[PDB]
Design a protein around this ligand. Structure first.
Ligand SMILES: *C/C=C(C)/C=C/C=C(C)/C=C/C1=C(C)CCCC1(C)C
Lengths: 133, 133
């Protein structure tokens, strides 16, 4: 049984922090790492191996069409049910989420090879910039 | 352009902490969140959108051939340089990482339909079990 190909999902984890302390990994990093799950992807072809380990905190998917108001559940983020309306205003993707939180939504657009995201809630605006891999 | 298709990886994130307290998220989740990185895949069909978001703490990618020494820089973990060599011991894949840490390496093998991983460094053994997806 030398074939280890596949996508492996962690089931159990013994003495993880003690091992990280042996590596002298700082306390704050250890306390975040002990929470998350782990997925190991192994691509094996003869004697040539490739591993990739991902930490992952939370996943988040959503599908919609512009102009169609739809009831959405903010999976993993805060687990709230909201009515969402994504519309165009020029070539900026603007969404307003109706619910128990004041002034909630986001704005998306592209300039060059960069995605520009602005999330708003209350008087807090979070500005993120993405690069295309 | 209104076309936002592609995989995007976050490169900068501002006021994410303030935006999150606006959503009444506990400070334990906030400390985990402000240090991850987000991968967003956008599937677009004119006006029908589909977003897939992944937040990730750290990644550990390796590629090697069994039986040939390879230099490794453990950025993402403890940031050390080691001389790694991977061999088979029957059905057990054995790796030795020669460097500053004593007895540093790991062992990986298939048992039943599960993958077993034992990470060693000095006196500490981290044991992990994986199921196949
Ligand atoms: C053959 C399998 C190997 C070498 C698996 C290695 C994975 C680790 C040593 C895990 C490392 C992690 C941390 C120390 C903290 C957070 C990030 C991880 C999951 C990559």
């Amino acid at each position: 049984t030398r074939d280890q190909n596949g996508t492996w999902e962690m089931e159990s984890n013994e003495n993880f922090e003690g091992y990280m302390k042996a590596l002298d990994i700082d306390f704050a990093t250890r306390k975040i790492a002990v929470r998350l799950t782990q997925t190991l992807v192994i691509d094996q072809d003869g004697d040539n191996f490739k591993f990739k380990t991902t930490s992952t905190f939370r996943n988040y998917d959503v599908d919609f069409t512009v102009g169609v108001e739809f009831d959405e559940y903010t999976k993993s983020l805060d687990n709230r049910h909201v009515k969402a309306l994504v519309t165009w205003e020029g070539d900026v993707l603007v969404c307003v989420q109706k619910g128990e939180k004041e002034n909630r939504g986001w704005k998306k657009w592209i300039e060059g090879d960069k995605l520009y995201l602005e999330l708003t809630c209350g008087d807090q605006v979070c500005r993120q910039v993405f690069k295309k891999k």
